[PDB]
């Protein structure tokens, strides 16, 4: 990821459920109440960019990352059952990149395997759609709608490549 990567910044903006392991004062503003002091075991969802570092530092870290819904057992079950049908966009805009960030934060091999599967399976149909140039179908429309931001970007790129190929090839 690039320090000036828009998508990276936006993904880092996304917050995750977390819980404190210390009762720090003068931090209630995190709870939108600067007057109040943070308490130990305080279940708070925090920005990824922040939550990450807070998890790193602390030994007992100052905060714990709770298992987010996007990586809930239900989510993996749905992924394994049917990757394509899954509306990754609904569960999150930047699900993939954030999953990679999670795996980097915690080396969760099974999660990586599931993500790799999902990626390949959905990429197959993404390529099918992008190649099916119209000489906006509803099927590819819904596939796009379920498409994630990164998936959307790659689809746009591939579709443009195919469009240029056709344009230069069929036409002078």
């Amino acid at each position: 990821m690039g320090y000036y990567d828009i998508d990276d910044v936006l993904a880092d903006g996304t917050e995750f459920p977390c819980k404190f392991q210390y009762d720090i004062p003068g931090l209630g503003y995190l709870e939108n109440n600067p007057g109040r002091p943070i308490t130990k075991n305080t279940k708070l969802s925090l920005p990824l960019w922040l939550a990450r570092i807070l998890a790193i530092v602390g030994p007992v870290p100052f905060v714990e990352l709770l298992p987010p819904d996007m990586f809930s057992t239900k989510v993996m079950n749905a992924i394994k059952t049917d990757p394509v049908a899954l509306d990754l966009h609904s569960i999150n805009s930047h699900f993939f990149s954030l999953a990679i960030k999670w795996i980097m934060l915690f080396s969760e091999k099974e999660l990586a395997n599931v993500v790799s599967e999902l990626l390949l399976q959905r990429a197959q149909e993404l390529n099918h759609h992008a190649s099916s140039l119209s000489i906006t179908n509803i099927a590819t429309s819904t596939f796009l709608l379920k498409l994630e931001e990164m998936e959307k970007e790659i689809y746009k790129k591939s579709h443009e490549s195919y469009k240029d190929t056709k344009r230069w090839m069929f036409k002078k």
Binding site: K74, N77, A78, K80, T81, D82, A85, L86
Partner: protein
């Protein structure tokens, strides 16, 4: 055949993989056995909900076969389940009927259907012969009804029993030669038979119409609906107007015009969903966990917890703390005694406030409605005396159930009750007082439970309650009805600059509320 037995043993292996299924089966078997033991005077049905994901993981091939070709996988699966149960089951001293019962074990699935998940409108012929699930609201629930499946017959003069089973499209996923549906009258040898009812086995057949969700219903389109053949335990698991998701095998039937007798042959085959399991969708009944019960117990330890709970109610609304407490008690209701002689002792509370326009009394009733477990919302003009209590309907002529009949053990609320027609008010009198409704119109004498709690709202006779004038002057309702009714809360507006500013700030902060996820300019969706 060979594939069928192979699938049977494969599902046996699957069951072995997750003892939880076998553990639940044993719990069912032991539970029913102990129920039968010492019956001073319900039995768990032989059915299991196997997690679909478990199958997908243990053997993706079998899982896919089930989802796509249920007619060829579910049968052997349930066969294996029944065999495992029986072998594992003790089945001690089974009754003669139990011997002939052959009561098998059914299967069911939970969640993770993916594409197979659908909706009545989104259903498609392609899905035919594939296990699928859909969601909708139940309508036109057909009545329960028995259905012959076996015709146990005793061969008199020979001392023997010759049973015959019966086939139907609904009964069996796979297509089979239809049974003649004729009771064996005489033995194939020639000895006359006798229909040994009871020993012969029957099943409960039900038909229901689940329609697409009106919320999902596209504009200018009548919501499509599909029928589900509920059977056995599945029968009577719902009723009309029940938003529910069901799982079944979407199946085709009939000749669809293909029959020679058909002349036009411009018709299509009939289709149905042999529901295997039904999942009711309240979105009701609240749920509790031991941790929550302990929290409640500790909370009761708090002294003024009554006050805390009352304040928790209508937090948006301000100033009616006493009315909030009254609503709290009402929701708690009280004890309704009923003497052995038969006398009925109302234990329910009724709450009503005469208030100025925009007093939020209507808003307060709205809050009580939504928070209530089971409530009935209506209004003076919008309500009808028969519509509120009951209306004799031509249907044999039946009796339509009014609001009071609905939510009989729940609560009810009325807006602008003062505006209610006095005839319907005297209609209410009996409902509320006797806690029951009786109708003898159209030559139909009837009596109905009517113990639902009632919380009306009204504006004074003069719009603004004149404290100078008598409450009787300010109240159009007869004192009998008032005395009939429980708790009169006269709420009056006042220009108390301090109080006016208090509520102004309250409402301003209310409008300033922020969804934690959302921000400024982001439209939604002590």
């Amino acid at each position: 055949d060979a594939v069928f037995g192979d699938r049977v043993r494969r599902f046996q292996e699957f069951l072995d993989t997750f003892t939880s299924y076998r553990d639940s089966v044993r719990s069912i078997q032991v539970y029913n056995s102990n129920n039968a033991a010492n019956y001073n005077d319900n039995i768990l049905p032989h059915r299991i909900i196997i997690s679909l994901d478990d199958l997908r993981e243990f053997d993706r091939s079998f899982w896919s076969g089930i989802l796509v070709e249920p007619a060829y996988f579910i049968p052997p699966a349930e066969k294996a389940l029944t065999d495992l149960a029986d072998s594992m089951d003790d089945v001690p001293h089974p009754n003669a009927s139990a011997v002939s019962s052959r009561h098998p074990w059914k299967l069911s699935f939970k969640g993770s259907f993916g594409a197979h998940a659908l909706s009545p409108r989104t259903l498609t012929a392609q899905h035919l012969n594939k296990l699928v699930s859909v969601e909708g609201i139940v309508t036109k629930t057909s009545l329960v009804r028995p259905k012959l499946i076996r015709s146990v017959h005793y061969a008199a003069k020979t001392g023997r029993f010759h049973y015959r089973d019966y086939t139907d499209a609904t009964t069996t996923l796979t297509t089979r030669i239809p049974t003649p549906a004729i009771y064996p009258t005489e033995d194939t040898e020639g000895n006359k038979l006798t229909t040994e009812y009871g020993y012969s086995t029957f099943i409960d057949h039900q038909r229901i119409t689940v329609q697409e969700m009106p919320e999902m219903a596209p504009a200018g389109q009548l919501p499509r609906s599909i029928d589900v053949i509920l059977d056995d335990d599945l029968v009577d698991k719902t009723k009309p107007g029940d938003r529910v998701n069901v799982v079944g095998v979407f199946k085709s039937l009939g000749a669809g015009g293909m029959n020679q007798s058909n002349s036009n042959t411009l018709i299509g085959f009939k289709t149905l969903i042999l529901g295997n399991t039904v999942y009711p969708l309240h979105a009701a009944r609240q749920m509790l966990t031991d941790f929550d019960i302990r929290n409640i117990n500790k909370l009761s330890k708090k002294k003024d917890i009554f006050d805390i709970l009352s304040q928790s109610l209508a937090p948006s609304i301000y100033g009616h703390d006493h009315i909030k407490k009254a609503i709290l008690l009402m929701l708690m209701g009280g004890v309704e005694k009923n003497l052995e002689n038969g006398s009925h002792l109302r234990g329910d509370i009724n709450i009503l406030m005469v208030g100025d326009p925009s007093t939020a009394k209507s808003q307060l009733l709205r809050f009580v409605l939504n928070t209530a477990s089971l409530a009935i919302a209506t209004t003076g003009r919008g309500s009808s005396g028969v519509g509120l209590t009951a209306a004799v309907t031509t249907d044999e002529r039946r009796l339509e159930a009014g609001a009071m009949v609905l939510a009989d053990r729940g609560v009810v609320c009325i807006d602008e009750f003062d505006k209610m027609t006095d005839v319907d008010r005297v209609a209410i009198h009996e409902v509320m007082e006797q806690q029951t409704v009786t109708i003898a119109k159209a030559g139909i004498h009837t009596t109905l439970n009517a113990r639902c709690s009632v919380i009306a709202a009204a504006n004074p006779v003069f719009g603004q309650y004149d404290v100078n004038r008598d409450p009787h002057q300010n109240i159009a309702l007869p004192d009998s009805l008032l005395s009939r009714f429980d708790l009169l809360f006269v709420v009056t507006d006042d220009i108390n600059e301090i109080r006016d500013r208090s509520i102004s700030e309250h409402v301003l902060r209310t409008h300033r509320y922020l969804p934690p996820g959302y921000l400024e300019g982001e439209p939604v969706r002590p």
